[PDB]
């Protein structure tokens with residue numbers, strides 16, 4: 161029941177009155193705590209300002225153009241060979257493999273897994289990925 | 292209602308009997324509830340008839356003819372009530388025409404020290420009751436701390452000046468009798484800082500409300516946090532305010548640290564994000580170069596070489612997707628920082644300009660309490676507030692002296708008679724006094740009873756101005772030391788022409804330091820002839836007294852010339868400066884509930900003193916030494932009305948002793 165915007169904890173009252181010089185010590189202490197936080201800000205602002213200058217250039221010299229490829233259901237000997245190497249490199253990553261081949265949906269790839277499981281030693285290939 | 296209003300105007304509950312009524316009518320309060328109402332109606336109706344016309348004595352015969360049935364059937368009941376009210380001064384008090392001329396057979400002898408209002412009121416009653424009453428007054432005038440300066444057209448009260456509402460105030464009754472002229476006070480009070488420019492509205496209100504908040508803060512601090520003792524000494528209203536303020540200054544700094552700590556937290560997230568993007572960009576840059584080299588192994592290539600291009604391409608657009616996500620995260624972090632950088636909490640709790648205007652409101656409080664706030668009891672300083680009268684505070688335009696003078700008509704007053712010694716014994720009392728003009732002339736006054744209205748300042752004096760033989764008991768002296776007797780002063784400035792704002796009764800001067808805050812802090816227009824009063828409060832009160840009149844009027848004209856211009860403030864035709872603490876018949880202004888004291892101390896003061904038996908083994912003597920005055924009335928100290936009531940009281944008490952009830 162204090163008035164609005166007044167701030168009077170039983171804890172703070174005892175902390176200010178416990179000693180003859182206590183309130184000035186409480187208040188000057190907070191002062192010297194706010195001064196050290198403000199220079200911590202300054203330090204981070206300048207550390208950050210240095211990082212932003214390294215990102216000048218974005219990644220735009222490095223983005224490739226986004227080729228779209230109409231998905232096809234026919235597996236070429238070429239596209240099969242990509243799939244093995246993709247399993248060799250990426251493991252169970254059905255999205256990545258779909259991306260590398262370019263024209264095979266994620267489903268077709270998981271289908272490719274069991275379909276050609278026996279013939280391409282796809283069990284052995286997945287073992288080699290775990291090196 | 293009108294019958295109910297009479298009770299309220301008599302400071303009485305209308306539907307209940309009081310403790311004092313219980314004492315005189317214990318058959319009725321312990322009796323059935325019906326007779327209680329009959330009693331209560333008779334009491335209220337008798338009060339009403341008196342209140343409805345206080346210029347004529349309301350006799351018992353008159354009261355009975357005016358009651359309607361069935362209330363006029365128990366005439367003995369009516370007679371008890373009427374005599375009760377008369378004795379305790381609830382009816383037929385102040386200045387009325389008597390129907391019955393006073394009986395020449397006078398009974399008992401009473402010496403009253405002081406003809407302040409308390410002394411005067413008691414005297415008039417005791418005379419009405421048929422006793423022999425003589426007043427001894429040290430000054431050359433009546434009125435005590437009611438003291439009106441008069442010179443030519445100029446009239447200005449150096450003492451009491453305000454009627455603190457008429458609703459329930461006995462001075463409302465008096466003013467009908469004395470036809471004194473009362474006037475309201477316009478509440479607008481422009482404050483001018485020491486530079487003479489005014490305080491703008493935005494800030495006057497911002498601070499007044501902050502001041503009102505800080506007060507309530509101490510009361511919460513007092514009642515809810517039991518913060519009334521600190522290092523074995525009683526906490527003062529001053530210390531509480533200082534603690535409250537420190538806590539607001541603490542909380543302002545707390546908010547700043549919380550706010551800037553939200554910024555480091557966010558800046559440090561940004562730091563880690565940027566680090567992730569810089570290491571991601573370098574990893575992307577390297578990868579792109581690899582794809583570029585693989586993409587330049589011109590076909591026809593075997594399938595591992597085709598895998599490498601398609602592989603690197605995949606790896607690369609994946610990392611570019613990662614980077615784009617991180618930079619959208621960087622957008623929403625960098626704007627949260629623009630957010631916090633644009634809502635910084637309050638910079639300071641109060642500025643030096645602010646804290647000075649705050650000091651003005653403190654001085655204003657120091658003024659009406661007539662003491663530095665460091666000396667007011669935190670726990671009990673506002674205790675008399677539960678009994679505020681209702682209605683507007685008024686000033687006495689024609690001079691408050693009109694009252695104590697009118698009261699003195701017909702009384703035997705010995706002016707220029709300073710009491711030196713009060714002797715009280717089983718057989719009676721001796722008051723020794725001297726002529727103030729020629730202290731070698733000595734006077735002995737023998738009396739049945741002595742009523743003391745010596746100011747609390749005077750009782751406080753060391754070494755004593757008045758010696759009691761035998762010495763007042765410890766329980767009385769210790770209350771005398773405990774209580775606070777304070778101090779305020781005025782400077783009367785009489786000009787020949789009004790240069791201030793006439794539609795404005797008050798304006799302020801803001802002191803430049805906490806210490807000087809009481810020094811000429813308020814200027815008051817209220818009289819017909821062009822007169823400004825200038826008030827001095829707080830720690831400034833005592834200090835200004837050791838400064839010459841001419842310097843004080845200098846400081847005044849200096850402040851005024853700063854406000855209205857040098858070209859517009861003429862020299863005063865006449866000036867007066869009160870110095871109430873140095874006045875030897877006052878020794879200060881009025882009482883205040885000092886820290887370490889309470890309102891119970893005010894009661895102790897009113898307790899009469901009973902001497903011990905002359906001969907040993909002799910029956911219990913009756914009380915001989917009685918006490919009135921503003922320091923003797925718990926619920927209404929430090930006022931004229933409180934003094935008046937206190938005198939009414941003692942007169943009733945003395946008459947009950949020496950005439951029988």
Ligand SMILES: Cc1cc2nc3c(=O)[nH]c(=O)nc-3n(C[C@H](O)[C@H](O)[C@H](O)COP(=O)(O)OP(=O)(O)OC[C@H]3O[C@@H](n4cnc5c(N)ncnc54)[C@H](O)[C@@H]3O)c2cc1C
Pocket residue numbers: 404405406407408409410427428429430433434435436437449450451452453454455708709710711744745746749756757779780871875876877879880881919920921922928929930931932934
């Ligand atoms: C500056 C000032 C302003 C005030 N303004 C207001 C106001 O606006 N409203 C309000 O309600 N109250 C006000 N008061 C308070 C009010 O005036 C007093 O409470 C009251 O009037 C005092 O009356 P009293 O009869 O108790 O004592 P006093 O009037 O002080 O009377 C005591 C008498 O005893 C005399 N005396 C002292 N020593 C001796 C001695 N040794 N021998 C003989 N006689 C002696 C004194 O000279 C005096 O006449 C003010 C007080 C002061 C000081």
Ligand SMILES: Cc1ccc(-c2ncc(OCC3CCNCC3)cc2-c2ccc(C#N)cc2)cc1
Pocket residue numbers: 450451452453455476658659660675684779781797882883928929930
């Ligand atoms: C403009 C203005 C108007 C009124 C008051 C005021 N209000 C209320 C008062 O209550 C009496 C107090 C007695 C001590 N316990 C608290 C109540 C007194 C005073 C007062 C009035 C005049 C003088 C003088 N000279 C001194 C004080 C002040 C300024």
